[PDB]
Ligand SMILES: C[C@@]1(c2cc(NC(=O)c3ccc(C#N)cn3)ccc2F)C[C@@H](C(F)(F)F)OC(N)=N1
Ligand code: NA
């Protein structure tokens with residue numbers, strides 16, 4: 062409890078490619094790098110020699126593999142994967158000292174799923190059964206882990222921004238990973254890690270929208286998405302506010318749609334004309350909320366045509382609701398306290414910043430009528 066030194070720094074990544082953890086599956090163990098994804102619920106690994114892949118699960122070599130004689134076809138907006146369902150022994154070598162029998166989807170066919178040049182070979186879905194595929198009776202990895210061992214029902218993530226690294230503490234919270242206090246928001250329903258946003262300010266100026274707009278039709282915390290993604294109507298307001306905030310410099314109109322990158326010469330990026338962005342989240346007590354504050358450092362992503370510092374705007378519009386992606390998560394230590402159905406935020410010990418402003422987590426604020434903000 063409180064101290065997990067063998068789990069610190071157990072995540073690796075390349076910028077724009079996600080954060081992965083080393084895992085092993087089968088007997089003898091086969092090592093794979095696996096993307097950590099709080100916005101899905103399948104454990105799925107490549108299992109055939111797709112050319113983008115460093116390595117893949119070879120079921121024939123595992124003496125503990127148990128076939129479920131059952132297929133799954135999983136499309137997303139950015140294409141799909143199909144696989145064969147089975148169970149096998151799974152450990153996390155820089156995780157708890159345990160081995161569990163878990164569902165595995167062995168990916169035999171995929172399109173636009175694996176990244177060419179990436180160093181990972183599957184996805185670890187950490188959200189709940191309700192969105193597991195084919196249906197909610199395919200028990201997710203984390204449910205199997207808690208069912209079979211004494212690991213407590215929680216994990217926390219510190220995603221350190223830009224190559225990338227970080228920590229997944231399975232079973233606990235490590236106090237050296239954050240500063241100040243944790244503040245908790247209720248997980249509104251266990252499917253995605255759904256939360257409720259109650260107010261959004263751009264440089265402390267409120268978007269003043271009916272708050273059902275910030276959660277139309279949900280808001281979720283997702284390490285498997287890069288952007289801060291905002292419902293279209295909120296996106297429009299957000300971006301006009303940021304446009305105005307920084308009319309001091311100018312950039313093309315394409316840039317705010319993530320349709321072109323923009324460029325200042327090495328070390329001339331003027332952070333200080335970009336506003337901070339606060340999100341107030343429903344608190345644990347009636348009429349009480351807290352706010353998290355992020356920086357241009359989180360929303361202007363480094364990309365590496367040009368011999369300069371070029372960034373991409375990584376707030377984007379959405380028709381699936383708000384998505385607090387790695388843009389948000391990289392500022393904070395985030396505790397997925399499944400046992401108490403809540404999610405805690407604290408200032409990350411690692412987050413990228415400058416001399417004037419830092420990411421922040423502050424409370425308590427009085428907000429009335431917060432139950433109006435959930436979309437039904
Ligand atoms: C299952 C899915 C997914 C994620 C990624 N993620 C990444 O490639 C990635 C890349 C960079 C970073 C960072 N930082 C994080 N993730 C790639 C393929 C997928 F199918 C689908 C995706 C969907 F939105 F489609 F549902 O959202 C989530 N939550 N997971
Ligand atoms: Na248990």
Ligand code: NA
Nearest residue numbers: 236237239240
């Ligand atoms: Na601390």
